[PDB]
C-alpha cells in the first residue's frame, strides 16, 4: 500500500521502476483466496481474479460486518410502510430504463467464431464484480453483505452475466444494471457459465439453480447503492494497463535484440549519457534495462547508429513515466475509492452528495496510454523497417532471406504489415474525451467517457501485439543470419590470407608488400560487400574479388605477375568464399535449435527469449520454400504463435526473468 | 453504365441510386463481362449468395487467350511460389481450441467481404489485361457458387491488397496450409482447401508463369468492403431523413421548414433541395405537423445539414462503381492490340480510401443531427409538452427513455473519434519503395464500424419516436374531449353569474391560454398534482375576468376541483382505451401521415415491438427496453428495413 | 532543487507561488544546475539580467573540455566544416524586406522574441557544465545579447526537434553573419539591424567559432524547452483561474458548497490533486453569503474533472525543470574526468513534446468544463432565477451575454480540434537517419495557441460571472424588503376576513411557495408582465386556503394588483440604488466571500470594467461588451492577474 512497487507514483522519481511494478503484479496468487477488505486490493489482484479464475471473498472480520451493518441500519431509519413500498418500486423503475443496451436476440445469429461482438468481454465483467464488492465493504453505500456474497458466488462458481458493449458514458449504470439484474434473477437476464465441459448461456435463475444459488432480493436504496459507481470502466482500464506494461518491456527487449542483430553500439546506453547528462528517471530506467540485456553480448559493440536505436531511451522514457503515473492513479481508483453517490458518513449521521462517479481520472490514464502505445509502435516499426532494408542493415541478406534473394523475399510482406499496424495505431491514438456530448437533458453536460477510451486503448494493445509479434519474429531470423555471417568470417579471414600467400608472395618476396596487400584487400572487400547484400551468392563474390583485383593491380604495381595470375586468384578466392558459405549454411541448418550457433554470440539475457520462441513455441528460422522444394507452414502461422503467446500472457514470465 | 441512377447535379438522387441497388436480382445468375458490374450486383453476390460466372461470349474468351498467349511468347513457377510464400504472413487463429462461445474469428476478414473480393477480382480479369487463364477465373466462381469462402487475415495490408489476395490465391490452388469456410450438410465447418474441393469434386488450379502476380495484384479486397460500407451508408442516410420527418411529427413542428422557397429558390444546392423534398414528401398528409412558436436547428436546419453529406455519398458512389466495375487495378497491364506492356500504379487505391474517409465524417455528422433531435425530444423543457422521459404513466416511477438518452450520447461520442482521418498516417513501407500507400482497407474497416455504431443510434431514435407519437396521439385524443368539458364546466359553475354580461367568451379564451401556458412546463408532474396545479392557476384568471361578479371563493374553488378531477378522469379513460386496442387500430394511425405510417406498422407489427406502459404500473417486469431496440437494430443490420424505407420515399 | 515547490506533498499553488517569486531585477546566475522554470520566464519576459555564475569550478571544467577537444590545411578545415554546417541550417523563411510590413502585421513567420531569449538562457546554462567544449567567450556573447536587448530574428518553422535550424540563426547572429538580422530597441523605437550593425552600437565584438564550437552551439533542444516552459507557465495560471471561476459560479448560481467537503475527497476518493482542487474551491467559498453551507455536473463534479489535469501539469513541471535546468541535450558529449566522448541521443526532445501533448489536452478539458458552467448560468431555464441573458433591464430589449455564450462555444470547439496529438505525425526525416523525431517545438506552438484560446474563453466567463454576481446581489436586496411587504399586504387586504380563523400562517406559507415556484420559470418576462403573472397564480391559491371566507373576487383581484404594483415598484427602487452607488460600495461586496471579493475588485476597480445596464435602457451606446472583455483578456495575457489569483488561493 505504501510500497511504491504495488502503488506506482506521480512525478518522475527513481525509487520505483516499471519492472518493480510488473514483478509485483505477476506475483499475485492464482490459487489462494483473494480477501477484499476495501483498502488493500491492488491491480495484480484484479487481474488474477478477472483472468485467472482466482477465488474471491469479502474478508472474514467483524470490523467489516460492523460497518456494513451500521450503514444498512442507518439507511433503515432513513406511513413508514408506503415509503418502503415506493422504495422497491423506485428500484424496479431504475433497473427498467437502465437495461437498454443492445445484445443478440437469440442463437440464430451465432455463426462459427462469431456472435458476441456487442457483448462486453467476460474478464472485464468479472473484474468489475470484484472491484464493486471491494468498495461496497467500506460501508459507504448501505448494501447488505448477502448481496456482496451474491456477487462473490457468481465469481467463484464461474457465472458471468452478459452485458452490452456500448451505452455508458462513464458517469457505468447500464452495465452494472445488467449485473444487478442477474443476481436478482431478472427474467430477461442471461448469463454465461461452463457446465461440465461445455459453456452455455442460460437465464440468470436457471443457472443458479444449477449451483443451489438463490436470487437475492434487493431492498430500499439497495439497488441505487449497487448500480451506482464506475467499476466497469476501472476494470477494463486495469486489464489494459496491465497488458500495456508488458508491451513496454517487450519493446525494450526487442530494442536490445535489434541492437545485436544490427551489430550496433551498446554505448548509447552508457550511464554517462543518462544518469549524468540528462537525469530523467525513466530515461535512466530504460537505458539501464537495455544496458543490462546487452551485457555479455558478442553481437553488439562495447568500446572502440541510427535514431531508432541511439535515441530509444529518450523516446520510450516519457511513455514509461506516463504508465507508472497511470498505475498510481488506477490503484487508488480500483482499490481505495468509493465511486458512488450519495455517500454515507455513518459515524457522523450524514449523507454527502458529490461526484465521485465522474471517471475522468481513469479516462485520463487511457488517453495517455493509447498515445504511448502509438509511440512504442513507431519506434519498433522504424527499428524493424531499417533492419529489413538491405541498404541499412549493415550487411544482412536482402529481406532476411536465408538463401539467394532471387527467389526469396521472406520478411518483405511483414515489412508491409508492420507499416499497416503502425498506421492504425496512429489513428487510434487521437483523444476520445474531446467528443463529450451534453447527455441526459444537459444534466450530465460533462462526462468522462472512460469505458469507451478503455476499449480503444484495449484495441491498441491488440495491434501493438501484432506489430511486436512481427518484430520478434524478424529479429530472430536476423540473429540467425548474423550468426551464420560470424561463422563464415571466422574461417574466411584466414582463407583470404592463405590464397594471397599461395598465388602471390612468390612475387612479393623481399618487398614489404604482403602486409599492405592483406590490409587493402580486406578493406575494399568489406567496403563493397556492404552494398551487395542483395546479390545472389555466386555473382556477389565474383563481384567482390573483381574489385579486390583492382587493389592488387595497385599495390603489386611493381611486381611481375601476369593479368592471368591475378584473375586466377580472383576466381579461386570467389570459388572459396562461395563454397565456404554453402558449407557453414548446411552446418547451421543441420544443427538443432538447442545447439544454434547464435547461442554462442547472444548475451545471457536475450538468449532466454531466443530459446522460448525457438524451443517452447517451436518457431524456427526459415530456409525458404523455393530452396526446400516444398511449401512449409506459412510465415503468418508462425507469427500467430508468437502473437498468441503475447495475448495469453505466457511471454510475461520470460520477460520478467530476463530483466529481473 | 450511362444511367445516373446506377453510376452515381439535380439529375439523380440518392433514392434513385438506392432503388436500382435494391432491385438487383438474387436468383438469376450474374454474368461478368468486365464493364457492366455495378454496386448493387456486388452486394447481391456478396451477401445474397447470388450465383456468378463469367459471361460466355467468345469475345471475352478471345481477349483472355490472346492475353495469355502474348505472355507465353515473352524458374517461372519458382517465383510464384516465392511470391505466395512471403505474402501468407497474416495473423489468424492456430486451431479451434481458442474458439469460445460466440468468439473466435476476430482476426479474420468478414466472409461477405471476401465473396465480394472474388467477384470484383474475376470481373476485372475478363478484360484481358492481366493474362490469367479462364480456368482460373472459374476456380473462383466455383468457390463462390458452392459457398466456399477462404479464411483470410483481417489486418496486414496498406492497400497498395496483396496479402489478403494471396490467401485467396493459395486456396484455389490447394495450398497445404490453406483453410476455407463452407456449409456442409446443414452445419458450418472450416477445413483445408483441398479437403473442401474434394467434397465438391473441384480441381486445385496450378498457377502458371506470371499468373500468380496477375492474380494476387490489385485492390479488390478494399473496393469490396468499401462497396458494402457505402451501400449501408446510403440506407442510414435515408433512415435519418425518415427519423427527421417522424420527429417533426412527435414534436408538432412546422412542415414549412422544407418549403421549396427555402431551398429550390433561395439556396439551390442540389442535394439540399433533394433532402428538403424527401422530408416534405414524408410529411404530406400528416395531422401532427403544422402546415398553415418556432422550431429549433435540429429540425429546421436539417436539409442544409444533411445536404452536404448526401452530395459526398452520391459522389462516392460514382467513384466506387468505376473502381469496382470498370477498372483493372493490376500491374503490369498488357495492351495486346499493340503488343506492349505498361508500368503504372493502378494498385494505389487512393480513390477508394477517399470515399471511405469522407463517408465516415458524414456518418458522424448524421449521428450528431439525429442525437440532437432525440435528446431534444426527450427533454421535458423542450419537447412541447410530451411526458418527462416518454413515460406512459406517472413520471415519478417511470423513466422510460432516460437510459436511452445517455446511450445516444455515447454512440455519438464514439462516432466523433472514429471520424478522424486514417490517411494522414501513412508510413514508409517496404524500404521506402511504397512511401505513399492508400490505407484503403483500414479506412473502410473504420467506416464499417461507424455504420454499425450509427445503426445502434438510429435504432434507438426510432424506438423513441414511435413511443413519442403514440404519446402524442393520446394527448390529441384527450384534447378532443377536454376542450368541450372545459366550456361545459365553466357554464355549469358560472354563467349563472355571467348572465347579462359579456364575459363568458373572455373567460373561456383566457382560461384556455392560461392552461396551455402552464401545462407546457408541467409535463413532468404526476397526473393528479399536475391538473390541480393547472386549474389552480386558471382559478387565478377567473378571479380577474369575473372580478365584478358575485361568486364566492368557495364557488371558484369548487369549479377548480371539479375541473381537475374531470381532467384526471378523462385522461385515465383515454389511456385505458389506447392500451385496449391492438397496435393495428392505434389512434396514432389517425394522425400519422400516410408515408410515415408505413414505418410505424413495420416496427409495431412485423417487428412486434409495442409501446411500453411501464413496469411499476403493470406490476410486472416485461421484456427489457434493450431487447426491443435490439430487434430494430437487427432489422437494420439485416437489410430487412431497406424495402420499407424505399416504399416510403419512392 | 530538493523542494518540490520548485520541482500529496506539493500543490499547484505551491508551484505557482515559487515562480512568481522570481526576481526580475537581481541578476540570474547560471551554474548549470540551479536554473528553474520561474527563472527562465523572468529572463525571457521580464528582461531580468543573466550572467554565467563566476566560479573557478565552472570556468575550469569549461576550459578542461575545450582543451580535451583541441588535443583531438587541417587547421582551417575545422573552421570550414563550421561554416558549412551553418550554411545549410540557415534555411527557414522570413520576410525578405520591410515592404511587406503592414500595420499590425509583418513578423508572423518569425519566432516570438520571448521564446528566443529563453532559448539563449537555457542554451547558456547547459553549456556551463563542460560537456560541450564551447569557450566561455561564446557564452558571454549570448549573455551580452540578452543583457543588451539584442534578439535574433529566427524562422517560426523548420525544426522537427531532433532544434538545429533556429539555434543556427542565433549562432550566426553572435558571429556576425552577413545576412543575420536582429531585433533591438535603440533609444526608444525598436529596430531590425544586421547583426554587425547592432553589435557596433553596444561595442560588442562578433565571436569567431573555432573547431566543434559550432556543432556544440547549434546542437540541442533549448528552443523547444523554452517555448514549452513559457506555455506550462501560462497553463498553471489558467487552471487556477479556472478553479476561481468555478467557486464564483457556485456563488452566482447560489450552489451547494457541500460538493467540496473533505469526506467526498480526502476520505472517499483520495486522489491527491482532486483533494487539492476540492480544497482550493472549498477555501474560496468560506464566508460566502451566496453559496449554501441538487447541483449539476459542471459544479458538482468539478474536482474530479479538474483533478486529473492538474496532476498532469504537476508532472509536466517535474519533467520540464529537469530538462531546462539540468539537462545537456548536445551530442557528442565529453566526459573530461575519464577522457572520453559519448555518442547518444539527448537531443531527442520526446520528454518535452510529451508535456506539450498532455497540456494541450488538459487545456481542452478546462475549456469544456468552464463552457458548460457558463452556458448553464446564461440559460434562463437553469440559472435558478437569474435574468434572461444576464440583462440588467427588461429582456425584451436586452440580450447582454447572448453573444458571449455563442463565442464561448466557438472557443471551446477550437480547443477540441487543437487537442489532437501532433507526435503521431512523424515523417522519416533526413534520408532516413532521423526516422523518429519529437516534433516538440511544433507541439509547443499548438499548446501556446490553446493557452491563448482558453484565455479568450476564461476572460468571457469572468466577465459574465461578474455581471451575474451583481444581478444576484440585487435579487437578495429585493427579497430582504419584499418578504415583509408580502405579509404586510396580506394582512391589509385580508386579515379582516381571516379574523378568528387559523388561516393566516397557511396562507403566507402557500403564497410564498407558489410565488417562488412560478417566479423561477418566468425570469425572462419584462417586470410588469412578470409580476402580474406571479400574483395571478398566487391569487389562485388564496382562492383555495381562504376558500371558506367571505372575500369577493374583486377584493382578491385588488390584492393581486397591489402586490404586483409594489413588487414592480420595489424592483425599480433597489435597482436605482445599485446603479447610483459606485463599484467600491456595491451590494455584492456584502454577500461575496472575502477571497472571491478580491477578483471582483480587481476587475471592477483596477481594470475599470463595470456592470452593464443596457444600451436601449440608457438611450446611449456605451463602449462595447467586447472592448471590456478585451481588457480582461489583456490582463490575463500580461500576467497582471497572476498575483491577484495567488493572493486569493495562498
From Swiss-Prot, chain B:
Q: EC number(s) in its UniProt entry?
A: 4.3.1.25
Give the organism the record lists.
Answer: Rhodotorula toruloides
| A GO BP annotation | cinnamic acid biosynthetic process
State the function annotated in the UniProt record. Answer: Catalyzes the non-oxidative deamination of L-phenylalanine and L-tyrosine to form trans-cinnamic acid and p-coumaric acid respectively with similar efficiencies. Facilitates the commitment step in phenylpropanoid pathways that produce secondary metabolites such as lignins, coumarins and flavonoids.
What are the disulfide bonds?
A: none
State the protein's name: Phenylalanine/tyrosine ammonia-lyase
Cellular compartments annotated: Cytoplasm
Keywords, A to Z, come to: Cytoplasm, Lyase, Phenylalanine catabolism, Phenylpropanoid metabolism
- Pathway in which the depicted protein is active: Phenylpropanoid metabolism; trans-cinnamate biosynthesis; trans-cinnamate from L-phenylalanine: step 1/1
Q: Describe its PTM?
A: Contains an active site 4-methylidene-imidazol-5-one (MIO), which is formed autocatalytically by cyclization and dehydration of residues Ala-Ser-Gly.
Entry GO MF terms: phenylalanine ammonia-lyase activity; tyrosine ammonia-lyase activity
Q: Which residues make up the binding site for (E)-cinnamate?
A: 217, 294, 300, 331, 402, 430, 433
Swiss-Prot record, chain C:
Name the GO terms of the biological process aspect. Answer: cinnamic acid biosynthetic process; L-phenylalanine catabolic process
Alphabetical keyword list: Cytoplasm, Lyase, Phenylalanine catabolism, Phenylpropanoid metabolism
Which InterPro entries does the record cross-reference, listed alphabetically? Aromatic_Lyase, Fumarase/histidase_N, L-Aspartase-like, Phe/His_NH3-lyase_AS, Phe_NH3-lyase, Phe_NH3-lyase_shielding_dom_sf
UniProt note: pH dependence: Optimum pH is 8.5.
In short, the EC number is 4.3.1.25
Give the UniProt subcellular location, in the record's own words.
Cytoplasm
Could you confirm whether the keyword Lyase appears in this record?
A: yes
Q: In which pathway does it act?
A: Phenylpropanoid metabolism; trans-cinnamate biosynthesis; trans-cinnamate from L-phenylalanine: step 1/1
Kindly give the CDD domains that the UniProt entry links to this protein.
PAL-HAL (cd00332)
**Binding positions for (E)-cinnamate?**
219, 294, 300, 331, 402, 430, 433
Its function, per the record, reads:
Catalyzes the non-oxidative deamination of L-phenylalanine and L-tyrosine to form trans-cinnamic acid and p-coumaric acid respectively with similar efficiencies. Facilitates the commitment step in phenylpropanoid pathways that produce secondary metabolites such as lignins, coumarins and flavonoids.
Quaternary structure (record): Homotetramer. Dimer of dimers.
Name the protein family.
Answer: Belongs to the PAL/histidase family.
What protein am I looking at?
A: Phenylalanine/tyrosine ammonia-lyase
Species annotation: Rhodotorula toruloides (Yeast)
Lineage of origin: Eukaryota, Fungi, Dikarya, Basidiomycota, Pucciniomycotina
Amino acid at each position: 500500500s505504501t510500497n511504491l512497487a504495488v502503488a506506482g507514483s506521480h512525478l518522475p522519481t527513481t525509487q520505483v521502476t516499471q519492472v518493480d511494478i510488473v514483478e509485483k503484479m505477476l506475483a499475485a496468487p492464482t490459487d489462494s483466496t483473494l480477501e477484499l477488505d476495501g483498502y488493500s486490493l491492488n491491480l495484480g489482484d484484479v487481474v488474477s481474479a478477472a483472468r485467472k479464475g482466482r477465488p474471491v471473498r469479502v474478508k472474514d472480520s467483524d470490523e467489516i460486518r460492523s460497518k456494513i451493518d451500521k450503514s444498512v441500519e442507518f439507511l433503515r431509519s432513513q406511513s413508514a410502510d408506503t415509503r418502503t413500498e415506493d422504495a422497491i418500486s423506485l428500484q424496479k423503475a431504475l433497473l427498467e430504463h437502465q437495461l437498454c443496451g443492445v445484445l443478440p436476440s437469440s442463437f440464430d445469429s451465432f455463426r462459427l467464431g462469431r456472435g458476441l461482438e456487442n457483448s462486453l468481454p467476460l474478464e472485464v465483467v468479472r473484474g468489475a464484480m470484484t472491484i464493486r464488492v471491494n468498495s461496497l465493504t467500506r460501508g459507504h453505500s448501505a448494501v447488505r453483505l448477502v448481496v456482496l456474497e451474491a456477487l462473490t458466488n457468481f465469481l467463484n462458481h464461474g457465472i458471468t452475466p452478459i452485458v452490452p458493449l456500448r451505452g455508458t458514458i462513464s458517469x457505468d449504470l447500464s452495465p452494472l444494471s445488467y449485473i444487478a439484474a442477474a443476481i436478482s434473477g431478472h427474467p430477461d437476464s442471461k448469463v454465461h457459465v461452463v457446465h461440465e465441459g461445455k459453456e452455455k448461456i442460460l437465464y440468470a435463475r436457471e443457472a443458479m439453480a444449477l449451483f443451489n444459488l438463490e436470487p437475492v432480493v434487493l431492498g430500499p436504496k439497495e439497488g441505487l447503492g449497487l448500480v451506482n459507481g464506475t467499476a466497469v470502466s476501472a476494470s477494463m482500464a486495469t486489464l489494459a494497463l496491465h497488458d500495456a506494461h508488458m508491451l513496454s518491456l517487450l519493446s525494450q527487449s526487442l530494442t536490445a535484440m535489434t541492437v545485436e542483430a544490427m551489430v550496433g553500439h551498446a554505448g548509447s546506453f552508457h550511464p554517462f549519457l543518462h544518469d549524468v547528462t540528462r537525469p530523467h528517471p525513466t530515461q535512466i530506467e530504460v537505458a539501464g534495462n537495455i544496458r543490462k540485456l546487452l551485457e555479455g553480448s558478442r553481437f553488439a559493440v562495447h568500446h572502440e547508429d541510427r535514431y531508432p536505436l541511439r535515441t530509444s531511451p529518450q523516446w520510450l522514457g516519457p511513455l514509461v513515466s506516463d504508465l507508472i503515473h497511470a498505475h498510481a492513479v488506477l490503484t487508488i481508483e480500483a482499490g481505495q475509492s468509493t465511486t458512488d453517490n450519495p455517500l454515507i458518513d455513518v459515524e457522523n449521521k450524514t449523507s454527502h452528495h458529490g461526484g465521485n462517479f465522474q471517471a475522468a481520472a481513469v479516462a485520463n490514464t487511457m488517453e495517455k496510454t493509447r498515445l504511448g502505445l502509438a509511440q512504442i509502435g513507431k519506434l519498433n516499426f522504424t527499428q524493424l523497417t531499417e533492419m529489413l532494408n538491405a541498404g541499412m542493415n549493415r550487411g544482412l541478406p536482402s529481406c532476411l532471406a536465408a538463401e539467394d534473394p532471387s527467389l526469396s523475399y521472406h520478411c518483405k510482406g511483414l515489412d508491409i504489415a508492420a507499416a499497416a499496424y503502425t498506421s492504425e495505431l496512429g489513428h487510434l491514438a487521437n483523444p476520445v474525451t474531446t467528443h463529450v456530448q451534453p447527455a441526459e437533458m444537459a444534466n450530465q453536460a460533462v462526462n468522462s467517457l472512460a469505458l469507451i477510451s478503455a476499449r480503444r486503448t484495449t484495441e491498441s494493445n491488440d495491434v501493438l501485439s501484432l506489430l511486436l509479434a512481427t518484430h520478434l519474429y524478424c529479429v530472430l531470423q536476423a540473429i540467425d543470419l548474423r550468426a551464420i555471417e560470424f561463422e563464415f568470417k571466422k574461417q574466411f579471414g584466414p582463407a583470404i590470407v592463405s590464397l594471397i600467400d599461395q598465388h602471390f608472395g612468390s612475387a612479393m618476396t623481399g618487398s614489404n608488400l604482403r602486409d599492405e596487400l592483406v590490409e587493402k584487400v580486406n578493406k575494399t572487400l568489406a567496403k563493397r560487400l556492404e552494398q551487395t547484400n542483395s546479390y545472389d551468392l555466386v555473382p556477389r563474390w565474383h563481384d567482390a574479388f573483381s574489385f579486390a583485383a583492382g587493389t592488387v593491380v595497385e599495390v603489386l604495381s611493381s611486381t611481375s605477375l601476369s593479368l592471368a595470375a591475378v584473375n586466377a586468384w580472383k576466381v579461386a578466392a570467389a570459388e572459396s568464399a562461395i563454397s565456404l558459405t554453402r558449407q557453414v549454411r548446411e552446418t547451421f541448418w543441420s544443427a538443432a535449435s538447442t545447439s544454434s550457433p547464435a547461442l554462442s554470440y547472444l548475451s545471457p539475457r536475450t538468449q532466454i527469449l531466443y530459446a522460448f520462441v525457438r524451443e517452447e513455441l517451436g518457431v524456427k528460422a526459415r530456409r525458404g520454400d523455393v530452396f526446400l522444394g516444398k511449401q512449409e507452414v506459412t510465415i503468418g502461422s508462425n507469427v500467430s504463435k508468437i502473437y498468441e503467446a503475447i495475448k495469453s500472457g505466457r511471454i510475461n514470465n520470460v520477460l520478467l526473468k530476463m530483466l529481473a
